[model samples]
Target: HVSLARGEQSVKRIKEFDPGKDSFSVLLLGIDARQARSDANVLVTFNRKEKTAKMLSIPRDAYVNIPGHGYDKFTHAHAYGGVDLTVKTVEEMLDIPVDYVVESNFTAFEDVVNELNGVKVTVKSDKVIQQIKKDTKGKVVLQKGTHTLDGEEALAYVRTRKADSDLLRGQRQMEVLSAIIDKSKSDTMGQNLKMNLSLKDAIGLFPFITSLKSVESIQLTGYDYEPAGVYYFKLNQQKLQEVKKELQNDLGV
Candidate 1:
């Protein structure tokens, strides 16, 4: 369920997440190992005192200066140098403590969703329907409304990019994540999942998640770019600042 798989693999790395049980942050990464890239980068911060959760989605193509690799897409941090480098890049850029990281490829994503007996999500547009029809041939039937989604459909919903900006797509993924978190908290979920998951520590927060006052989501703002014929997302200074402010507030500092 979880892995300190990327970096130091020590309590030092998790200082903020459990120090006196105050507050902490977790990073969720979806590595596209088939394509040899880190496809998704999501950071979630939780405050024990406030009983709150907040999500921040980082665009894969975010322009960043990777140590030893130089300037490149933020997602490249993992594929280029592994999770250790990826973790370093995030802490440096966001100025937030990354207490833990739970990572897996798309296959694991699908498996987890299916294990949950499917996740219930609300689709506001028909685009999801259209995408499913074209890509998966509607094998996982869903409509433009609230419905439960199995692993395949759940993966499609999060990874699809045919309908909107990367940022908005990230928001959509957050919706699915929220659903999963909700389902995880409820005894209403299926008994399919065992008493233990491959990464139990990674998924340890469901009970804690149930105690949250609320969940807030935000994505880094930026413009698409191709500098020197390489794609990237040039970050917006003001928008980045706003998000940092929100995270700081979430941490109760």
Candidate 2:
């Protein structure tokens, strides 16, 4: 079981998580392959009644309290204590019960796109194109326009910081994830995907998955904070509270 280390949810649930009836929250983690840390963190809340979902991308470099570890980069939660601490850290930061946790690494991301025969992503920066080429050793070159990118190309596209800031990269990650889920008839990243949900749970979510009408995208608002030559994203407390209220309402809690 991929359940939390606490052996139970951090907070009381309003109701048993049933995708067909109740709105619930899931923490989607994108792990870094080489560094072996959580590189991307997206908190997704699904409102079954509204047939809508919200994807809130949290920057990895966010300076936040990591439960037992004081304040540090959000990514370190994974490196320090793996999924359990990461989940707890998120619960502490968001003040919401993480009903489920899904962890996927770079391999899973690439496999998902490749399984779907690739995904269409618009490239706006020449920097992204050049970086992709550089990373792939001139094997996978993406033009400065809309094109269907395979696994390798798509991974580079989302992971590249040469194009812009981390906030934009977070948005790109969400976009790619949304695109993948939108195109899939069902789950695709079976190999590298790890989650707490059971087989019955997966089957139960099929209806809600197929019937999703709208997905609202959210990004944590913050400014750069670098001290001692180490950078961090200092979240705006006011906006974070606003987001918390919005997500609570979305979950009907």
Candidate 3:
């Protein structure tokens, strides 16, 4: 059932908008099944003429006008209308044409964390741990420090929101995502492990590599941008309007 060579075909259906030549955008959505809907923690990237991309993470709770549904939290668009409406609402808010979308469910999150051995994350507050303990049934736990967290713990780190607001949690999610990207792209790990590992370790990890080998890879070059402040509590009418105005101008919706 697993076809390593056909990964290209799997991605062939995605729209091809070359960021290498011009500007392009993609949406990243994080869905929570427990809530019976999908939440959109969207990141829109702008690829400039230079080999660099600028990314902006949209808050899920940003109240926006969903085309068919009037105004509501952006996350509800996904639950009420699915990806098409989610994309449409985002396009309306940001005023940009979204070329493609990369989505990961709860299962994919756990699997990737496990496959990569673990993820390194920084804890900014004690409340994060407490929140995770309460919501996820104590499956994820973390001490306040830089540590390599296992799959469950990593999920808790991103999903927990007791100490901070949803906006802050989104910012932390981007931080973890960037760390994972850096680790995966490191030459020391990729090249050295290929030579030093035993046959069994190599073979076991080989399957995981093969699984992802077919898709085209995009790199985020240049500086990274993350939102600041406690997003949940800090968000007010003024900030929401600023975000809306910025996105609308940038995307030309």
Best by TM-score: 2
The lDDT values for all models are 0.72, 0.81, 0.55
Local error of candidate 1 at residue 129 (angstroms): 1.7
Candidate 2 lDDT tens digits, 129-241: 78778877898788877788899988887887752247877888888888777667545656688888775776678677667899889767988888887888899999899
**Model 2 TM-score, all chains together:** 0.90
**Residue-by-residue lDDT tens digits, candidate 1, 230-249:** 77898998988888777766
Candidate 3: worst-modelled 10 consecutive residues by lDDT: 215-224
| Worst lDDT 10-window in candidate 2 | 9-18
**Top candidate when judged by lDDT against the true structure:** 2
Write down the lDDT that model 1 would get: 0.72
| Candidate 2: pairs in clash | none
Model 3: per-residue lDDT, tens digit, 1-253? 1122223221222444343344445566777654234553655544333223334556565656878998766677878876667767766765556654555676677766777888888776777777777887876667888888777887777776653235566666777776565456532222111122244533453333333322222211122222543232223555556655654444333
